Amino acid sequence: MLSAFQLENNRLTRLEVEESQPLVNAVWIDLVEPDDDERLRVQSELGQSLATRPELEDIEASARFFEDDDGLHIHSFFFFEDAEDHAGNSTVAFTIRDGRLFTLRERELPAFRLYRMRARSQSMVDGNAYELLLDLFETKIEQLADEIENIYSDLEQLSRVIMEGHQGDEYDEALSTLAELEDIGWKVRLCLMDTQRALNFLVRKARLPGGQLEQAREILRDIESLLPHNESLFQKVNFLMQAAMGFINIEQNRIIK
Amino acid sequence: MLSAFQLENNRLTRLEVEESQPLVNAVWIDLVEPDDDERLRVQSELGQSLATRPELEDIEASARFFEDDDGLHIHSFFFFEDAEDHAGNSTVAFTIRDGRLFTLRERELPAFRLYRMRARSQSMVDGNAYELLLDLFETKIEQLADEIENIYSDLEQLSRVIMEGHQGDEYDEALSTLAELEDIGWKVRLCLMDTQRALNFLVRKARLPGGQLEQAREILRDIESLLPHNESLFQKVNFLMQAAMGFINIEQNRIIK
Amino acid sequence: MLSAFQLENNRLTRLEVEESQPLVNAVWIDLVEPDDDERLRVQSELGQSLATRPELEDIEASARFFEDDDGLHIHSFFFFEDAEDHAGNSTVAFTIRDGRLFTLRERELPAFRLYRMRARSQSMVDGNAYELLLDLFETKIEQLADEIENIYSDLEQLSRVIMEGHQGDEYDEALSTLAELEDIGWKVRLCLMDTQRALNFLVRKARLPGGQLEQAREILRDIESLLPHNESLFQKVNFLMQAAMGFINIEQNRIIK
Amino acid sequence: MLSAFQLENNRLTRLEVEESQPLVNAVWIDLVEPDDDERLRVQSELGQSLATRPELEDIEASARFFEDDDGLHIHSFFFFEDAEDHAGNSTVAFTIRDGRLFTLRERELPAFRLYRMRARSQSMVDGNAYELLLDLFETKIEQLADEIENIYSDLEQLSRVIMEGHQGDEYDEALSTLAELEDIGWKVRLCLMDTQRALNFLVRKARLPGGQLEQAREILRDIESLLPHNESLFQKVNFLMQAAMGFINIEQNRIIK
Amino acid sequence: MLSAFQLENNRLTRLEVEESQPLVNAVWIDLVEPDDDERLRVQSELGQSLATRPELEDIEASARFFEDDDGLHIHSFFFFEDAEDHAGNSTVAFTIRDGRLFTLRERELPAFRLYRMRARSQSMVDGNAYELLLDLFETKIEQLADEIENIYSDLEQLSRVIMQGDEYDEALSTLAELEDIGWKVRLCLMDTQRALNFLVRKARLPGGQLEQAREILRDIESLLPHNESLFQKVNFLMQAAMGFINIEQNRIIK
Ligand SMILES: [Mg+2]
Ligand SMILES: [Mg+2]
Ligand SMILES: [Mg+2]
Ligand SMILES: [Mg+2]
Ligand SMILES: [Mg+2]
Ligand SMILES: [Mg+2]
């Protein structure tokens, strides 16, 4: 799946690619699960080699944040929910070269789907690959903050089930919920920590235009403010786990009598 | 619910608003669950758009602490107890523009009720929106310190109940109490951490008059001194939880014999 | 209970007060649970208002370490054991004004009782309110170190009971002891952390004579050296708790067979 | 087992040693479980004493990272899996002297086997003992990152077994798996922490050619980026352990009824 | 028990003290559980008052690392095993005054026995009280590292045991014994670290000694993390075992 976009008065406009062949006009090429036809197309029409599937699995800093003849690379985790409502992080490879952004990903993602909806009716400022990459990160952070906001309200409800329920039915269900919330928080944190590394890397490496620099700093400031929330949930979740076991042991004593 | 206040020799005096229409004389406009009539009134009489309900839910730094054409914004958690004695944090949107403070909130709050009682018979110093915002924060911290002081004495009593035990139904009751105290501490900490971000933001952003700057620093110094107390209570609470489970297991062994 | 002391060749000498009325000659006035007669006496004979009972309950920094027209104030936790051998921390309000020290406290305290015994036959160096305040702190630290030393030996003995006992009688008793030791350590730590704040405050605030400054630094160095011991005991205590539960579960399995 | 290598246009080429005796041409001598014949050979043909078996067991810094008349020594843990699929760390003694690298090890190791396979068809840059040592470390890190990547996917699967399963068969198996994953992470961390010390030592000690210095820094940057992942897995593992016990206690209550 | 040593070409040689009375020639006086005769002897023959029994119990920095008219004092924990193989830390009072080292201790200790064995047949470098004190510390650290090395291999074996029986009472006991050793090893390290930081700032240590002290500090910095790593493992194993016991209990009930 190849989509391509070009700039028209600081507005991202979707190029037609199946028909209008010239990719050279694009500022952003976005690949989703691309076949070897789409990869070869990008290879010949632009200069661009793209990361292979197994190289997006690598977690080492030097494998994720680096510069080479193929440009500036940032591999970042993006958060999503699979078909059965289970959280995950999918790695996305960002590459910037000759003022163009390339995004390569294994799947559809809510930050991208959201950015693209908005991009249809919203001007960029400086209008360049770096602003665009940071815009995708801004959107990612906005969505992680929503996730956290939801863990809070779910944990609030679940806290009351744990104080007020005693049946076994309500309690199997409670530990499962707790475990699902821990997992989301955990994945959210991986997502934040990685974005944070990525942004620190760019601040030191790219000659980011000054408008971009402030933007990146704003994003770093948001991450600094969400991480503590993450840690706060893990304390609550662990405490609730402990309390439940307490209630189960008390119940068991009742039963034995 | 719209209340408005004005200054008379550095004393906050309540304006009559249902009758005396001129709001322009007010230094502080305080809205509680305002209908669209009250919002429109503020909009036309002063320049002021106010945050919507869903924007007070956003927890990201950039959504809470920011400057724009509508002024300087600080969204801060305030602590309260709902009808059934369950702790919570309610977000309050502070806005300062043209030397006036606007507070927008979802509910009545004890810090506000307390500040207002005192404001009746107590002079301000410099007499301005920034002092006023910091006064509300001073008051908030004073109350969070009281909360913590109370968790201490409650935990002290509950500690003794747990050493006797010697179980039914003194022990169901003991874990419930523990769990209520953990939750208050937890919510107190969120409240402190957020006030701390807000105050760090203001120290860097507003041209705070020097009298205000010291005031802000004093409040930050207090938060620095309360956070450790918070962390201390979690250690105790977690240990007590562990001990109780110990006593329950010992009891269970007795029963089985 | 009002006692007063005066200096005679750098020696603190108890000046009889029921008879010899002139309090002006005293360097140190020490009140324990003073009635309104003793408070009024200090108020009229010296310039001195004294903190009320509820103000000694406040735990925020600005309520404990501050300067005002009534002088320099330090409120510090002191460690003690109540009638039923339960550890506690009692707040003592220190005030220095016009070269005189005022101590106000709710109860007898072992540091004070000890300092006073020694003061009968021991010269001070510079002979002033600040030295005197730091001497009381030195004594406090000496006693907290003794507490910790004792938690170690008690925990050593209890460690052996936990490996070698199996009866239920010996194990109720073991968890209780553990819980008692955790509580002492916990209260010791609060006592240290607070003294540490107090001393940091003085180092920056009072024009401490240079002999006093070194003294304060020595005390801070001691606290830096006791805090780690405190943290070490919590690890042990927690581990022992876990082991005991292990033994109880093993025992329970034996019983069921 | 003695292997030796020499440089030919920055390409490591395996010398024949059973036949072609001259070892003086080698840049790298690699010993695996060497007999006293192979040790004596290295001793006489080059100047080189080699660490004894018990000296590779010493874990203090001064025993692992040091310079002496026999050259520059680095003893580093390398990760492996024994015959029964149990993780372990084997110490390898690196020595550099007169532009030659000596590696002494107790066993075959996957980093070495991998480096050697690649070395057959891949040019070095500067072509020296220090580059070579850092290449082996680069390889080691690449493999530790693979390990961590695998703990993640295994923990992902195991997380779902723990939420969905009730049978005892699936749960014995689940704790065992958890315990195996904890042990790998644990050993991976020891391996990283030690490599980190080693590289910090070299950065301060060897006159590393500038191309090597950047290489070492790149490796340090990767370790800084993997350690947090390690800590993240322990939190998950510990939580899952707790949850499982919860489910077992719930099951036990069912059984008793 | 009074032993005394003197220097002969940078070699520590044991003086005869029951017979050859002159103590003034000694560089190192080592007392173990000394009676008031041996204390008075040191008091009169040299200038030296020695710490009392209860003052070696004090754990406050100011009670352990300090300078006064009786010289430079360092009280440090040393690791040992009592008669029933139970780990402990015994405080040793080091005092340096007029180029002489005094050690006062409650008991025999393996670092001291080891140092003395070696001191027979091994030259010192600069040959002074400060080198001698640091040599005793070097030896102490060498032994703590051995302890940790052993907790590792024991924990490795015990890990496998933990993956019906009488084997499980035994396993928790072993775990608890290993936790205790690690714990005591840490106390020993943390204290030595405080002592060495104190000396670096306080004594006019000759430059050869300064590097020596820094080497020792570097070793401690490298052992402490190992200590913390073992507690994580030990705590986890404890948790796992309880898991297995609960699973077993469920089997039984069925
Ligand atoms: Mg890889
Ligand atoms: Mg949102
Ligand atoms: Mg636990
Ligand atoms: Mg208060
Ligand atoms: Mg050794
Ligand atoms: Mg003492």
Coordinates of C-alpha atoms and ligand atoms in Angstrom, one line a residue, chain A residues 242, chain B residues 242, chain C residues 242, chain D residues 242, chain E residues 239, ligand 3:
Chain A
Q242 CA -2.5 -7.2 46.7
Chain B
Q242 CA 1.5 -7.9 54.0
Chain C
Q242 CA 7.9 -13.0 53.1
Chain D
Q242 CA 1.4 -12.0 41.4
Chain E
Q239 CA 7.8 -15.6 45.3
Ligands
MG3 MG 4.6 -9.3 47.5

